[PDB]
Nucleic acid binder design. Structure first.
Ligand code: ZN
Ligand code: ZN
Ligand code: ZN
Lengths: 212, 690, 330, 65, 640, 43
RNA sequence: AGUCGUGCGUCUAGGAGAGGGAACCCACU
């Protein structure tokens, strides 16, 4: 590596690069399987090679990464490309005489250990558009309704009527959830895997209770 | 000084032009695409070659589309006409070079040796999962392949086990890279060599830094400079040249810059070049002679080997360097080649010693070739070969650059040798001769076929060589009247030619036109080349009659040459002559196309025209006046013209030629068995046609 | 900065220009060389760890490239001659005829005696291996800082004015924000991170936006820093519109115009945004002031401000602990 | 130096569209907000991440090394 | 359109032009350039004579003389990497060229490679284009000289005294040469006796005279023997009897002296050094009075009346302050303060080192009873001065006032910019006197109100505003000649009793003379300065209340640019000279890169104003606010 | 073992040898990165 | 409308540690 950037900087940038994880369940954590180091059964190996030329700067993208390990017919670890041009995520720029040559090992993991594993960027969660449950006391100076614009989801619920009294028996319901995926996993598979993980955690709790 | 630094920087830039833009443009093309143009861009982008260029940028913008179109047409021609041997490679790691991907692949040494893949060869790669291992892979599969990708060979590294590592450069944005997975079999087949295209592109880019850039853009030759007549006469007497030739040489040498010399065939063009070289040497100054074809370079080298006389009359033989391969160059020129001259001049501890010895030998060879080039005074080569890497590394300025057959080469090829700081350029060419080789008719429509010498002649009239010796005055009459618009004077030997015989007899005359009353030509779909049997039969009968008349009195070894516009017709004639006459046709008779036969002169020339059917008014290549001039000017004593009367009469030039022949009584009706009185059918047909 | 061998250099990972920039900044060229980043600040007391002007920074943002820094430290060594014909030598000590040997590991040193770039050095590891002949020689290596460590970035060797060999070794380290690190807005507010929360725990707006920073509101009244809230509102308006906002002192624009523009952008006029508790999803009773704001990571960091001594070296003059954490003082 | 790979606030990948952002600003001569909206950035976190970024990598590459 | 009014926003464009013409480090670069151009030659010429002679001094490009090597061009990056000194050698011709040393070269000066370098050239040299230079590379370390604040010289400052002290009011002037051979001459005149003390006497502490002498004896020595002439010089308006009543004790006590020789003898009585008062001491006292007493006004005996007139003016100011008709002078005002940049500091260091070298070569010549210039004496001295910050004549000096040179801070670009434009106050960081620490109202537009360190240094270290520049100095002789030719009566011919109305003209604190038509002269001077004939840095102030004209050309004066407003307009309302056409021209020039800040100065659209001049002008807040939804901040009404 | 700041060409000089670049007069003489394996993590 | 010039290269596998005072400047609570 001889780029103007730093090895730690480029490594951090590479870590955030999304990778295909449709068959992540098939892949096993490195800490679990008995392997010396980053065996093909628990890791994905890619190689990044690049260098500049006379007067044209070399831009390094996600597509430049080349898978070197054997995936055994699994569509996992492929860089995610979504831009119209198809270049991918810009990584760095190399000038004439600047040689970049490195290897990347990707392991199975969760976003809790590091945000780079986050499959969803923003997860919007809303409920009770109209202030029916009195959960929030809108801050107002002249008029609460005028100051605070109506939410988009408000159209999906009947507007409140001042005639009726406050419903103290009402509880939170009809939660509007918008899930956006970075690209590693489709939103449908994202929610499916989240439900599966929660169910597996509850089942593990039950198993621990039974064992103890 | 500052000027020296600027000159050095300009030379370095000219000799170190990056090829990356050319690779980017070429690799974006689709091999499977079958169209007149590489892309679907609007036709309006292409523009005809402007006579005057405002600035180098406009010249480059005009030329680059034409060069790309020519390259695409050459690629298509290689794909269709030629079928290179396919091979297979294993994909490796990919390196993201600037706007490119370099893929390392391992191949067998025998496979690449058989295919003939070098470091400057273009290939097309494809993925064929359903391809049967036993199936005979061919270029047809690549053309019909769903996915194809162009690649350029960069390096070829040999390694134990007979393993060749090849670095293939492809366009980054190309989607085919998605199939370039590790340990993946990819079927690749060669297309063509990009060395000439790369050199042309480099010259086009560097034209800005050329010393004569202004003259090239303006295309205006430097004004003539008056010279004393006494000096011209002295030079003519010393070199034994002609008055007109001596005056033209003196005028060209006196003025600095581009010099135009129009030498019609048979006017001592090689003699004129020798005189120019001798005059320049008499007045170290390295001189670079460049010719479009290796044959011209070999002829020039052979002529120079005999020595060139100076003003004092003392013949001398300056060291001559031929920059070319031994196989392509003539056998006689092998000694003059750089490799042979260097060889003549030269005359795990074991592994390390062997490697050190090999490195020492390589260094000694490099030093020897550098010394030979530095001491050499005359360097003869081709336009493409003039840009050889060795010369660029040497970086030796060539003050005088002579270009031969300036009308037979493209502008880029002619300008290629000028990169080496060419201050004086002397271009010799005859516009009436064959135009520069072009693969695309569309490019010709944009005046791409037009060479720089054509524009220079249009701007100013060159010094036409009026005196000719080999060409018979009758033969040169019609070309002089029409093609050259006069200004041609027959030499002293108007009728004192050594080949006196076979002229007195009435049937055989210096010029004749034996038309065919009836003739049908068949066109082959595979080759699209017309073939006619009447022409072949007439030619065979005439040759047999000539041999019978002088079977033993005179030997026709290398004196009879049959030329036809179409390759298929010439091949059929050769086959028929071999079947009938036998092996004697190998030497006695020479069969070759008119374009290919250019540069060769024979006592008897049989120009056979294939166009016989009158159904289609189209004339074809026969319409062009330059081809007719080339065909007529290659003869010395006897010309036998064969072709249907009406089809030729359709064209204006051919109609004028027929009228002139009738005026000179050179027209004689001919048909099958013309000289066979036994066949009464031929006599009856001739009588009826009268 | 790659070629500059400064004694101490700090480089921000992802410099960002402020959303609200004074018209004089372009003349100062601050936009070309910004010092800070635009982080989504919520002025609320969420977990109680931002009290006393403290702040809560998102752990996910921290590990995703938020306020990461590169610290470069350069050590210089010379072969200054003490007496003619006697000079120091840059060579790896071999323990032979040497009496002064320190805990620094000399294995990292190469044959030349200088660690090449890409070598891990920590603690008292020797960076430059120099030995002064004595009349056989005594070690004079330059040990690495005890309290600082990292990957050696570059090494250069030249000749001084008198021709003596001179060496300069620059070591680069990556420093990530921590709780003890000090940050500050552009209004004289200085805060030390109290706790690092992942994107899940921190509250999220109705659009799913999780703030990068949370600041206790109590910092505003006492400090009289009304400009911070106006800057946050202007930054929100600029981000929504996409056009950089003018935050010059005496600009004709007023707070009412900014609020009107924000309302036109489909948000609360005064910048308050409904937020949800990340622990349980319950809507917060009181709406939270929210929006982007420019922040700067000050050089004051806990990593270099933490010291501890247990029977360390003592001054010869008084047999008492020496002064300075870098020298293992007390 | 280079555009951040993912948004600090939410984590959305924004490095792909930096070149597209520059092309829209230059080729189409579109305003900042319109270009960002076309690229598909709704939340203002990504909007300020892209808008506020500075291309110091080019300036560093201006040097010979 | 072209002459239409100008909006507030368009003014920003003009501001941009300023930063293009000068930049953020303009002051230091200009000071260093003017130093190396003129001050070095002036110092060489001042001590050129010896009992040998130096004709000219030449400065080459920076170079390094490596041992066992060949000298070659040295660049700032190479110096920083190799810890070399970025200095250029000095060549001086000697007659009956010699390398005298190396002068450090400031970045972005007129003697550095990066000056005539484009962005591509700077990158090729591994130099950041954003770097503003303005520092010295010593042993690789980057050192910046902080502007030093000092009390302006050649000005009379009158201060009261505490009740316990017998003195009531003291008027002090720090006379010093503005051309060469600078030496501090603090002349103080004190009024002994508090209110009601019944002893209203005034005594001036002549330099080298410990015992204060009455002003009457000084006037007698100068040549004004008659008491009436002394009173007329002291008091201009005979109508004011209070001044005469207060001065009556002074003349009563000075009546003893009536002869010039007696006055000179009495002056020479104190400070005896084994001399005879009547033998070769009257000449000594006369020489002291010619040089020591008010050296700045003149240094020749041809016209000694100027000293008498200046002393009379000083006594008049002291009496006015004592009578309470004139407010006490304030030290915090920048009009009386000068900010010496790297220019004057390097000039002093040079002067000292060159004097030391001259002494050394003189000693060497004396030894050689029957070349050999120690160049290191200057180079090493300068290196030490720029290394530890000890600004002293020699290393052994303990009162060098360290802190002048500080390691440039490069934590961030803004920090470097602030440090390069930083100012320091020589007052010790200790003490608990809040008055100097507080920023005076004069700091408006010259010192940033907010940017300042917190703690002991608070209120002492100051940072100049964006549109603030330090005068580099100019020759006042053209101004003196113009004033004399325009109708300024010589001070020798001044006749106050027959000239009740007259405006005194002061140039660099020198009372050259008086003028009868102050308005016309002031208008002509302003027109010439706006046209560009006179350097804009010169500050001209006219006070009608005191009827005094002051002209300042000395360096170290802080000034800022402001638009000029004139009543000439078709509409008739007050409008600025700058119009839409000038802004359009500036925008066109910016787009092209013809019309820059220099053109604005030449056309008179923008004028430089210093601290002193601001006391005699009214400034509008905005271009169009003071000339002609309760959300906008309340704006002060345009009463004027 | 060493490279030039400007030429960026390998020198591989030894002890008791000049530290100046052979190609040019510049003598910065930077050193290339260590051949030892180096690993980094995105954390 | 049916044909064509141009280029490439030849030797490669063996055990242990211990130390700077003064002055100046910047900066933090
Ligand atoms: Zn494993
Ligand atoms: Zn985001
Ligand atoms: Zn070099």
């Amino acid at each position: 590596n001889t780029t103007v950037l730093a090895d730690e900087f480029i490594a951090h940038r590479l870590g955030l690069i999304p990778l295909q994880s449709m068959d992540i369940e098939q892949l096993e954590y490195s800490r679990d399987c008995f392997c010396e180091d980053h065996c093909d059964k628990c890791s994905v190996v890619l190689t990044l090679q690049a260098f500049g030329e006379s007067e044209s700067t070399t831009n390094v993208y996600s597509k430049d990464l080349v898978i070197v390990s054997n995936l055994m017919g699994r569509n996992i670890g492929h860089p995610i490309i979504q831009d119209k041009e198809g270049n991918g995520v810009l990584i760095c720029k190399l000038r004439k005489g600047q040689e970049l040559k490195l290897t990347c090992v990707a392991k199975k993991g969760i976003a809790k250990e590091h945000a780079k594993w986050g499959p969803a960027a923003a997860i919007e969660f809303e409920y009770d558009p109209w202030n029916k449950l009195k959960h929030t006391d809108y801050w107002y100076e002249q008029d609460s309704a005028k100051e605070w614009p109506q939410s988009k989801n408000c159209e999906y619920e009947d507007p409140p009527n001042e005639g009726d009294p406050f419903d103290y028996k009402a509880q939170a319901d009809t939660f509007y959830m918008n899930v956006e995926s970075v690209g590693s996993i489709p939103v449908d598979q994202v929610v499916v895997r989240g439900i599966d993980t929660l169910q597996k955690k509850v089942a593990s709790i039950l198993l621990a209770l039974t064992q103890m | 000084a500052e000027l020296a630094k600027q000159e050095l920087e300009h030379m370095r830039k000219r000799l170190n032009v990056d090829m990356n833009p050319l690779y980017e443009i070429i690799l974006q093309w689709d091999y499977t695409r079958n169209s007149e143009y590489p892309d679907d861009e609007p036709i309006g982008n292409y523009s005809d070659v402007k006579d005057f260029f405002n600035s180098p940028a406009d010249y480059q913008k005009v030329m680059k589309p034409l060069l790309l179109l020519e390259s695409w047409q050459g690629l298509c021609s290689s794909r269709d006409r030629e079928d290179y041997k396919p091979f297979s490679i294993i994909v490796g790691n990919r390196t993201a070079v600037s706007d490119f991907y370099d893929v390392y692949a391992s191949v067998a040494k025998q496979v690449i040796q058989d295919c003939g893949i070098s470091e400057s060869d273009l290939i097309v790669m494809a993925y064929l999962p359903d391809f049967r291992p036993d199936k005979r892979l061919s270029s047809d599969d690549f053309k019909k392949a769903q996915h194809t990708c162009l690649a350029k060979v960069r390096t070829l590294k040999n390694t134990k086990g007979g393993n060749v590592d090849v670095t293939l450069r492809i366009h980054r944005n190309h989607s085919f890279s998605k199939f370039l997975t590790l340990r993946s079999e990819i079927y690749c087949v060669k297309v063509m060599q990009m060395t000439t295209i790369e050199r042309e592109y480099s010259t086009l880019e560097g034209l800005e830094y050329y010393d004569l850039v202004g003259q090239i853009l303006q295309a205006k030759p430097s004004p003539p400079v008056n010279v004393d007549a006494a000096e011209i006469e002295t030079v003519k007497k010393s070199y034994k040249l002609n008055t007109s030739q001596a005056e033209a040489i003196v005028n060209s040498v006196s003025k600095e810059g581009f010099s135009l010399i129009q030498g019609p065939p048979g006017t001592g063009k090689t003699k004129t070049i020798l005189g120019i070289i001798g005059y320049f040497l008499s007045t170290k100054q390295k001189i670079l002679i460049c010719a479009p074809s290796n044959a011209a370079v070999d002829e020039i080298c052979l002529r120079l080997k005999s020595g060139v006389y100076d003003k004092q009359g003392h013949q001398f033989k300056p060291q001559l360097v031929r920059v070319g391969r031994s196989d392509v160059v003539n056998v006689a020129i092998k000694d003059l080649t750089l490799e042979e001259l260097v060889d003549k001049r030269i005359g795990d501890e074991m592994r390390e010693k062997n490697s050190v010895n090999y490195r020492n030998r390589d260094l000694d060879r490099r030093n020897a070739q550098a010394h030979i080039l530095a001491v050499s005074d005359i360097i003869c080569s081709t336009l493409s070969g003039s840009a050889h890497d060795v010369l660029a590394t040497m970086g030796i300025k060539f003050d005088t650059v002579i270009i031969d057959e300036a009308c037979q080469c493209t502008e880029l090829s002619s300008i290629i040798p000028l990169r080496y700081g060419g201050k004086r350029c002397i271009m010799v060419g005859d516009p009436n001769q064959l135009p520069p080789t072009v693969l695309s008719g569309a490019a010709s429509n944009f005046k791409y076929n037009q060479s720089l010498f054509v524009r220079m002649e249009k701007n100013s009239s060159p010094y036409l060589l009026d005196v000719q010796y080999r060409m018979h005055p009758s033969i040169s009459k019609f070309p002089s009247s029409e093609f050259y618009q006069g200004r041609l004077k027959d030499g002293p030997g108007m009728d004192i030619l050594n080949k006196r015989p076979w002229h007195q007899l009435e049937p055989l005359a210096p010029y004749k036109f034996f038309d065919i009353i009836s003739g049908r030509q068949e066109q082959n779909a595979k080759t699209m080349s017309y073939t006619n049997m009447e022409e072949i039969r007439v030619a065979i009968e005439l040759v047999d009659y000539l041999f019978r008349k002088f079977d033993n009195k005179i030997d026709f070894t290398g004196k009879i040459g049959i030329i036809s516009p179409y390759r298929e017709q010439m091949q059929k004639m050769r086959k028929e002559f071999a079947r009938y006459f036998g092996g004697m046709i190998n030497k006695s008779i020479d069969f070759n196309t008119i374009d290919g036969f250019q540069g060769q002169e024979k006592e008897i020339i049989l120009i056979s025209c294939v166009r016989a059917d009158d159904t289609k008014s189209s004339v074809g290549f026969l319409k062009d006046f330059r081809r007719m001039n080339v065909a007529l000017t290659r003869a010395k004593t006897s010309i036998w013209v064969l072709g249907h009367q009406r089809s030729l009469a359709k064209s204006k030039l051919w109609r004028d030629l027929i009228e002139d022949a009738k005026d000179r009584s050179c027209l004689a009706y001919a048909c099958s068995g013309f000289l066979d009185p036994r066949n009464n059918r031929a006599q009856s047909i001739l009588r009826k046609f009268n | 900065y790659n070629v500059r061998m400064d004694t101490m250099a700090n480089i921000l990972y992802y410099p960002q220009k402020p959303l609200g920039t004074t018209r004089a900044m372009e003349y100062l060229k601050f936009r070309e060389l910004p010092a800070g980043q635009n982080a989504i600040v919520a002025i609320a007391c969420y977990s109680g760890y931002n009290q006393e002007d403290s702040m809560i920074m998102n752990q996910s943002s921290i590990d995703r490239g938020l306020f990461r820094s590169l610290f470069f430290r350069s050590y210089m060594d010379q072969e200054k001659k003490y007496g003619m014909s006697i000079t120091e030598t840059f060579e790896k000590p071999q323990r032979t005829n040497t009496l002064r040997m320190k805990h620094g590991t000399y294995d990292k040193l190469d044959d030349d005696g200088l660690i090449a770039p890409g070598v891990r050095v920590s603690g008292e590891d020797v960076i430059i291996g120099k030995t002064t002949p004595i009349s056989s020689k005594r070690d004079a290596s330059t040990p690495l800082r005890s309290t600082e460590n990292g990957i050696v970035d570059q090494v250069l060797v030249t000749t001084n004015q008198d021709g003596l060999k001179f060496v300069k070794v620059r070591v680069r380290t990556t420093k990530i924000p921590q709780i003890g690190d000090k940050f500050a807005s552009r209004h004289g507010q200085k805060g030390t991170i109290g706790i690092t929360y992942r994107r899940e725990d921190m509250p999220f707006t109705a659009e799913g936006i999780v703030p990068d920073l949370i600041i206790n509101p109590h910092a505003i009244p006492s400090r009289m820093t009304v400009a911070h809230l106006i800057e946050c509102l202007l930054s929100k308006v600029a981000a929504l519109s996409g056009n950089e906002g003018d935050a010059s002192p005496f600009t004709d624009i007023t707070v009412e115009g900014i609020s009107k523009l924000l309302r036109e952008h489909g948000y609360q006029s005064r910048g308050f945004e409904v937020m949800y508790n990340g622990h349980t999803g319950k809507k917060l009773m009181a709406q939270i002031f929210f929006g982007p704001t420019y922040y700067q990571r000050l050089r004051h960091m806990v990593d270099d401000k933490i010291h501890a001594r247990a029977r360390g070296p003592m001054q010869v003059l008084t047999r008492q602990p020496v002064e300075g954490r870098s020298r293992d003082g007390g | 130096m280079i555009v951040p790979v993912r948004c600090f606030s939410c984590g959305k990948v924004v490095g792909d569209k930096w070149e597209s952002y520059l092309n829209l600003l230059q080729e189409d001569e579109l305003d900042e907000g319109t270009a960002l909206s076309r690229l598909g950035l709704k939340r203002y976190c990504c909007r300020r991440m892209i808008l506020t970024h500075v291309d110091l990598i080019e300036k560093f590459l201006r040097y010979n090394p | 359109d072209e002459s239409a009014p100008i909006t507030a926003e368009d003014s920003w464009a003009v501001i941009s032009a300023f930063f293009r013409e000068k930049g953020l480090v303009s002051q230091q670069l200009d000071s260093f350039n003017q130093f190396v151009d003129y001050t070095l030659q002036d110092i060489i010429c001042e001590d050129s004579t010896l009992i040998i002679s130096f004709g000219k001094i030449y400065v080459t490009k920076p170079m390094v003389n490596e041992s066992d090597g060949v000298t070659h061009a040295l660049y700032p990056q190479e110096a920083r990497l190799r810890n070399l000194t970025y200095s250029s050698g000095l060549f001086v011709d000697v007659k009956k060229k010699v390398f005298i040393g190396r002068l450090p070269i400031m970045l972005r000066s007129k003697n550095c490679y990066l000056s005539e370098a484009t962005e591509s050239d700077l990158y090729k040299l591994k130099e950041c284009p954003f770097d503003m230079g303005g520092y010295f590379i010593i042993n690789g370390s980057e050192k910046v000289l902080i502007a030093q604040e000092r009390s302006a010289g050649n000005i009379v400052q009158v201060f009261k005294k505490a009740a316990p002290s017998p003195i009531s009011h003291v008027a002090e002037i720090r006379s010093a040469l503005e051309k060469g051979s600078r030496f501090i001459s603090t002349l103080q005149v004190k009024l002994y006796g508090r209110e009601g003390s019944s002893a209203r006497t005034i005594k001036a502490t002549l330099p080298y005279i410990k015992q204060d002498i009455p002003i009457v004896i000084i006037f007698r020595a100068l040549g004004i023997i008659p008491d009436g002439e002394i009173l007329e010089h002291i008091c201009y308006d005979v109508n004011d009897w209070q001044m005469l009543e207060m001065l009556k004790p002074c003349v009563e006590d000075g009546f003893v002296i009536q002869d010039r020789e007696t006055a000179l003898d009495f002056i020479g009585r104190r400070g005896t050094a084994l001399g005879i008062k009547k033998e070769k001491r009257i000449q000594y006292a006369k020489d002291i009075l010619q040089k020591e007493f008010l050296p700045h006004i003149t240094q020749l005996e041809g016209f000694e009346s100027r000293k008498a007139f200046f002393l009379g003016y000083m006594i008049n100011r002291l009496l006015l302050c004592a009578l309470d008709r004139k407010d006490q002078d304030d030290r915090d005002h920048f009009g009386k303060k000068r900010l010496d940049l790297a220019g004057p500091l390097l000039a002093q260091l040079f002067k000292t080192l060159f004097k030391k070298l001259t002494k050394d070569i003189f000693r060497y010549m004396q030894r050689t009873v029957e070349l050999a210039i120690n160049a290191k004496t200057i180079t090493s001295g300068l290196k030490y001065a720029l290394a530890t910050g000890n600004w002293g004549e020699q290393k052994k000096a303990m009162s060098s006032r360290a802190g002048v040179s500080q390691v440039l801070n490069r934590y961030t670009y803004s920090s470097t910019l602030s440090h390069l434009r930083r100012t320091n106050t020589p007052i010790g960081r200790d003490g608990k006197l809040a008055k100097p620490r507080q920023l005076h109202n004069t700091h408006w537009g010259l010192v940033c109100p907010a940017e300042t360190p917190e703690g002991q240094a608070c209120g002492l270290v100051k940072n100049l505003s964006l549109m603030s520049c330090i005068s580099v100095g100019t020759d006042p002789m053209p101004i003196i000649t113009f004033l004399s030719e325009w109708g300024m009566e010589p001070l020798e011919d001044y006749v106050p009793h027959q000239s009740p109305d007259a405006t005194r003209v002061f140039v660099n604190g020198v009372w050259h003379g008086v003028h009868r038509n102050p308005a016309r002269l002031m208008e002509t001077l302003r027109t010439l300065r706006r046209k560009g004939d006179i350097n804009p840095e010169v500050s001209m102030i006219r006070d009608i209340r005191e009827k005094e004209l002051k002209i300042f050309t000395d360096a170290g004066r802080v000034y800022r640019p402001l638009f000029i407003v004139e009543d000439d307009e078709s509409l008739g309302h007050k409008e600025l000279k700058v119009r839409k056409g000038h802004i359009a021209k500036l925008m066109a020039t910016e787009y092209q890169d013809e019309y820059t800040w220099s053109s604005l100065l030449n056309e008179g659209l923008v004028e430089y104003i210093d601290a002193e001049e601001e006391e005699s002008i009214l400034i509008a807040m905005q271009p169009e606010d003071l000339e002609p939804d309760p959300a906008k901040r309340i704006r002060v009404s345009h009463h004027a | 073992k060493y490279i030039c700041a400007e030429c960026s060409s390998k020198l591989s000089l030894s002890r008791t040898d000049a530290v100046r670049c052979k190609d040019c007069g510049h003598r910065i003489l930077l050193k290339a990165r260590t051949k030892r394996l180096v690993q980094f993590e995105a954390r």
